[PDB]
């Protein structure tokens, strides 16, 4: 049943400045010491990502994808909820990450007004059309745990990305520096049409909520210049939407561009109105003597 603990005064959404982070492998192709440009749904650099501090679980929309960066010292965040209506009317999807395995079910579930984590998240289930075992689990002291999970949906596939790296420095709930690539772990032929997103938080009250934060960042179609190293890993990338130095690096693919002037873009001031100008009306048709006549015959 729906519950709500005390001391939950208020936590309005916030915003942070995500640094260069959120680049994933767009394809299963090996590249050694060569650059590559691709057009997919990436995360823009120096964007504005939400700052939901897990110290509240709103229903945020799923336009093209999310980043979902998390930094915590526990395993409270161990689930997600996908769907278009989040009820028993349409199809739904959930990704629960148990302490020993991961489960995914596309049953037509019925979620309450506040899901929380057992299976006390949905009231009435329904028939599933897909299930997977997920043998390994997806989600020390000073070193905390940093995890990020990219979710997309092109035609029917989910193509979940993931990368976990221990963070060694402590910061007031801020994204760390450096670079990190998202490795594709599992693919889903589920084929669901999702338009919203909902997380799943554990409680373990027996209140002990710990400290965490999920950073939901929307994805936009960009053009990145990857830096495949000699072992196939990615060292850095270019957003190609920052200061014109970035676009110069895109059109002159390198990272040690020499001195000089280069033609990169083409400006174009774009419209701002849909003016249509036709002449005056004149000589209206005789529809006033055929719809407002006096007498007909038969």
């Amino acid at each position: 049943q729906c519950v709500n603990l005390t001391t939950r005064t208020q936590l309005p959404p916030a915003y942070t400045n995500s640094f260069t982070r959120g680049v994933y492998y767009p394809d299963k192709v090996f590249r050694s010491s060569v650059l590559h440009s691709t057009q997919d749904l990436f995360l823009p650099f120096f964007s504005n990502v939400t700052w939901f501090h897990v110290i509240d679980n709103p229903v945020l929309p799923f336009n093209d994808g999310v980043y979902f960066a998390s930094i915590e010292k526990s395993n409270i965040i161990r689930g997600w909820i996908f769907g278009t209506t989040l009820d028993s009317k349409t199809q739904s999807l959930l990704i629960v990450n148990n302490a020993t395995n991961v489960v995914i079910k596309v049953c037509e579930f019925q979620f309450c007004n506040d899901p929380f984590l057992e299976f006390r998240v949905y009231s009435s289930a329904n028939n599933c059309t897909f299930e997977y075992v997920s043998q390994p689990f997806l989600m020390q002291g000073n070193f905390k745990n940093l995890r990020e999970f990219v979710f997309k949906n092109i035609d029917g596939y989910f193509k979940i990305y993931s990368k976990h790296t221990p963070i060694i420095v402590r910061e007031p709930e801020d994204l760390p520096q450096g670079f990190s690539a998202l490795e594709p772990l599992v693919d889903l032929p589920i084929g669901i049409n999702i338009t919203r997103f909902q997380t799943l938080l554990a409680l373990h009250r027996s209140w002990t909520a710990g400290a965490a934060a999920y950073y939901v960042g929307y994805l936009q179609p960009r053009t990145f210049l990857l830096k495949y190293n000699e072992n196939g890993t990615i060292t850095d990338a270019v957003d190609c939407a920052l200061d014109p130095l970035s676009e110069t690096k895109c059109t002159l693919k390198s990272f040690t561009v020499e001195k000089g002037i280069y033609q990169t873009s083409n400006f174009r001031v774009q419209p701002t109105e849909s003016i249509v100008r036709f002449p005056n009306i004149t000589n209206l048709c005789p529809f006033d003597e055929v719809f407002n006549a006096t007498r007909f015959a038969s």
């Binding site: 014109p244 130095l245 990272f255 561009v257 001195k259 002037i261 280069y262």
Partner: peptide, 29 residues
């Protein structure tokens, strides 16, 4: 305009065919 990614990272955009009123901002020919 870029001195190169070896001594600095500052750039200088140069639009062509603009009177600096349709985009330090100087007006050259």
């Amino acid at each position: 305009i870029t001195p190169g990614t070896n001594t600095s990272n500052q750039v200088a955009v140069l639009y062509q065919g603009v009177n600096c009123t349709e985009v330090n901002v100087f007006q050259t020919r």
